[PDB]
């Protein structure tokens, strides 16, 4: 089963999603979005908590599925601490790149998921001895998912900066860890 | 409206 980090992230995302249905998306975004006014710049959690907000059922389900699988595997093979660091780095950097391109009104775990995809794949490719890899069918499924975001094949406005920065981060960390 | 990651 899912280890403690994999689990607490899933619980966190569900709690926030429930709060968003009860209070409305806008109210939760006031608390958890990337700082959108200079007065919020020291509210450190905001540089990460954008990753916990989801706006559609499809969005939360697919992100949590990928997180459960790829996060669960990273945590099992390489430890909880590794998953925590991938998560913090991808959330922070994906958010930074997103806000730079399109401003602070974004959310979702997909920056982190795209990091895990690139991480697990490249680490398996460059360092088979790690005991982690992305199997063929999931390479294809991950590629289609990526392609769909890039070419806007969901009926939703995408955080393309978050997604590409996420993937970059995962590939970069795999490269670093495979030395 | 909002962008989805
Ligand atoms: Cl499980």
DSSP string for B1-5: -PEE-
The experimental method, as deposited, was: X-ray
Nearest to A4 by CA among A53, A65, A75, A58: A75
CA of A129 vs chain B CAs: smallest distance (Å): 32
Strands B3-4 and A106-107, sheet pairing: parallel
Instruction: Pull the structure tokens for residue A66.
Output: 């990928």
Q: Where are the domains of chain A?
A: 1-179
Q: Distance between CA A65 and CA A52 in Å, rounded?
A: 14
Task: Tell me the longest C-alpha to C-alpha distance in chain A.
Answer: 48
Angstrom CA distances, A157 to A141, A148, A175, stand at 21, 12, 31
Architecture of the domain whose range is A1-179: Up-down Bundle (1.20)
How many CB atoms sit inside 10 A of residue A48's CB?
Answer: 18
Instruction: Pull the structure tokens for residue A163.
Output: 């997604």
Q: Distance between CA A161 and CA A103 in Å, rounded?
A: 10
Is A154 in Cβ contact with B5 (below 8 Å)?
Answer: no
Q: Distance between CA A19 and CA A114 in Å, rounded?
A: 25
Final resolution, Å:
2.0
Q: Distance between CA A54 and CA A14 in Å, rounded?
A: 9
Give the position of tokens 């289609």: A144
| Residue A110 appears among annotated catalytic residues | yes
Residues of chain B with a CB closer than 8 angstroms to some CB in chain A = 1-5
């Amino acid at each position: 089963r899912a280890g403690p980090v994999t689990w607490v992230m899933m619980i966190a995302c569900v709690v926030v999603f429930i709060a968003m249905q009860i209070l409305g998306d806008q109210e939760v975004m006031l608390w958890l979005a990337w700082p959108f006014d200079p007065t919020l710049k020291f509210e450190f959690w905001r540089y990460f908590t954008h990753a916990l907000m989801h706006f559609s059922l499809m969005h939360i389900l697919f992100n949590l599925l990928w997180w459960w699988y790829l996060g669960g595997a990273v945590e099992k093979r390489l430890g909880s601490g590794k998953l925590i660091v991938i998560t913090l780095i991808s959330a922070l950097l994906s958010g930074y790149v997103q806000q730079k391109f399109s401003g602070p009104w974004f959310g979702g775990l997909s920056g982190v998921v795209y990091a895990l995809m690139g991480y697990v794949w490249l680490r398996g490719e460059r360092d088979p001895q790690s005991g982690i890899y992305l199997q063929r069918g999931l390479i294809i499924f991950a590629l289609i998912w990526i392609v769909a975001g890039w070419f806007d094949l969901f009926g939703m406005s995408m955080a393309n900066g978050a997604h590409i920065a996420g993937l970059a981060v995962g590939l970069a960390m795999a490269f670093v860890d495979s030395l | 409206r909002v962008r989805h990651a």
